[PDB]
């Protein structure tokens, strides 16, 4: 089921808890909020404070708050206290352009990936009412392009242009409580490298990373047309599959065993990972071009209630069309 | 005006201001700017007007903002912002000069061009490595210079006023009372 919002590309998209409202950015310095009045999408609100290209949005559902980041070295936190949305200021202390933003499972911190060889973890302070940041910078050598969060609200995956996929810990003692022991490691100070991967010789830029529901498995896609899954329960082990298609730009877990991917071929695909450590291609999911999307897909999200029970998933990309895909 | 586009001085002042705000930037290295302007067409951009016409702005993007660093291009006698900053820091007592090198803050709306942060650092480092410490390129590492420029530069006059009125909201000596001018007519604070 395809819907065409605008002819311009969609940089990024965000959903809310009831899957009623959607936030979009049509390749400009603005954010548009749309709602569904019956069976037709009609625009609802406009948010305009940036003076640069907007690069990332996310929507914390339980608190109902929208975090926005862009290439003007700014970030804002939008909240709805009256009929009109209002912003709140974030101090980031970066000198290059931001590239990614994401909320945490507990909705108390959020992580921003930027091009100054930094990862900024920001948390709230109310004595003077803004957000203050802490930096992770030790082993990173280039710009970060992807981020993800662990279910236990401490660990943080990151992919960067230096052909590496890393797992850090982002424990902030002022906000968070002490964590338990994970297979990934035991000793978890702030900004300590927990694990590193990326040794394959002909490594390319990593565009997307993702954790599983169990939290003990990581998956990432690269620009050399390869997908890879790293397991940490039995041992710190990797399994890499070399696909014969164009590069993939996003990845997300559907369950413990299956992973869904999308990219420049305009068609989402499904891979299977066995318990014994083997990746095998299964099939496409879309059996002018002979494909519903007319350009590269940039973002894949879950319409359903995420990795515990996932049934449908949403795709959006440069063509301007947004599509909902159902497995059944 | 030297492309076939005629904008009168009075009635089209606010139409070219949007072009300046949207498409202008300060170059880091002039050489690569001219190489990309002469042998490549990735600097030309099309701007739509209210009348419906489409104009094209090319190499003029990085020539207009450089009246700041070279002031003689529009008939102004001086030294430019980078050298005037040097002449201002190198005019105080010796002990406090380090206190000013580390903390330079940019404010105002006419310092939001892309690259203006990254050019003053290079100009000051080169102006301080051939005027004060001539040659001997080892001690510049110990010489720390830093420029602060948060993405909230435009309203820094307001935000400061948003703090000073908050701290001193209650005690009734900060303000000039109405009754003071009923008798005295002047102020000493």
């Amino acid at each position: 089921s395809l819907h065409q919002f605008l002819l311009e590309p969609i940089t990024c998209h965000a959903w809310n808890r009831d899957r009623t409202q959607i936030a979009l950015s049509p390749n400009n310095h603005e954010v548009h909020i749309y709602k569904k009045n019956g069976g037709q999408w009609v625009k609802a609100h406009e948010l305009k404070e940036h003076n640069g290209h907007i690069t990332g949005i996310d929507w914390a559902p339980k608190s109902d708050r929208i975090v926005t980041c862009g290439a003007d070295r700014n970030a804002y936190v939008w909240s709805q206290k009256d009929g009109v949305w209002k912003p709140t200021l974030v101090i980031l202390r970066i000198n290059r352009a931001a590239t990614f933003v994401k909320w945490s499972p507990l909705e108390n911190k959020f992580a921003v990936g930027s091009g100054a060889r930094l990862i900024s973890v920001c948390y709230f302070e109310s004595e003077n009412d803004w957000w203050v940041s802490k930096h992770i910078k030790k082993p990173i050598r280039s710009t970060v392009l992807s981020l993800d969060w662990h279910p236990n609200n401490v660990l943080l995956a990151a992919g960067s242009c230096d052909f590496k996929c890393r797992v850090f810990s982002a424990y902030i003692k002022e906000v968070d409580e002490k964590p338990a022991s994970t297979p990934w490691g035991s000793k978890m100070p702030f900004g300590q490298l927990m694990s590193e991967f990326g040794g394959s010789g002909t490594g390319g830029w990593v565009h997307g990373v993702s954790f599983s529901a169990s939290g003990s498995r990581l998956a990432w896609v690269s620009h050399d047309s390869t997908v890879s899954v790293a397991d940490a329960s039995k041992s710190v082990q990797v399994s890499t599959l070399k696909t014969e298609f164009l590069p993939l730009l996003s990845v997300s877990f559907v369950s413990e065993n299956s992973v869904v991917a999308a990219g420049h071929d305009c068609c989402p695909m499904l891979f299977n990972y066995d318990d014994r450590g083997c990746l095998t291609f299964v099939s496409k999911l879309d059996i002018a071009l002979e494909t519903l999307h007319q350009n590269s897909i940039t973002q894949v999200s879950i319409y359903e209630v995420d990795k515990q029970d996932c049934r449908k998933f949403c795709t959006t990309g440069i063509d301007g069309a947004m599509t909902i895909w159902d497995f059944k | 005006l030297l492309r076939g586009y005629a904008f009168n001085h009075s009635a089209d002042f606010e139409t070219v201001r949007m072009i300046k705000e949207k498409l202008c930037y300060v170059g880091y290295n002039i050489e690569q700017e001219q190489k990309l302007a002469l042998e490549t067409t990735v600097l030309v951009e099309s701007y739509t007007l209210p009348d419906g016409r489409i104009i094209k702005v090319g190499g003029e993007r990085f020539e207009a903002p450089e009246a700041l660093f070279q002031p003689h291009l529009i008939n102004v006698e001086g030294v430019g912002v980078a050298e005037l900053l040097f002449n201002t820091i190198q005019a105080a007592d010796i002990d406090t000069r380090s206190e000013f090198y580390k903390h330079i803050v940019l404010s105002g709306g006419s310092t939001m061009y892309p690259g203006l942060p990254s050019r003053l650092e290079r100009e000051l480092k080169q102006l301080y490595l051939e005027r004060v410490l001539k040659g001997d390129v080892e001690k510049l590492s110990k010489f720390k210079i830093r420029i602060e420029d948060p993405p909230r530069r435009k309203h820094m006059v307001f935000l400061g006023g948003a703090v000073l009125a908050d701290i001193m909201k209650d005690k009734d000596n900060f303000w000039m009372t109405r009754q003071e001018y009923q008798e005295k007519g002047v102020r000493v604070l």
Partner: peptide, 30 residues
């Protein structure tokens, strides 16, 4: 010759807490 201020000392203000509050701002911003 002259003090750091490069001016005559202002005896009226000499004859007659912001710094406490500003430290948190200085920490958070920098």
């Amino acid at each position: 010759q002259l003090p750091v201020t490069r001016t005559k000392i202002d005896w009226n203000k000499i004859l007659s807490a912001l710094m406490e509050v500003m430290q948190k701002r200085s920490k958070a911003i920098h």
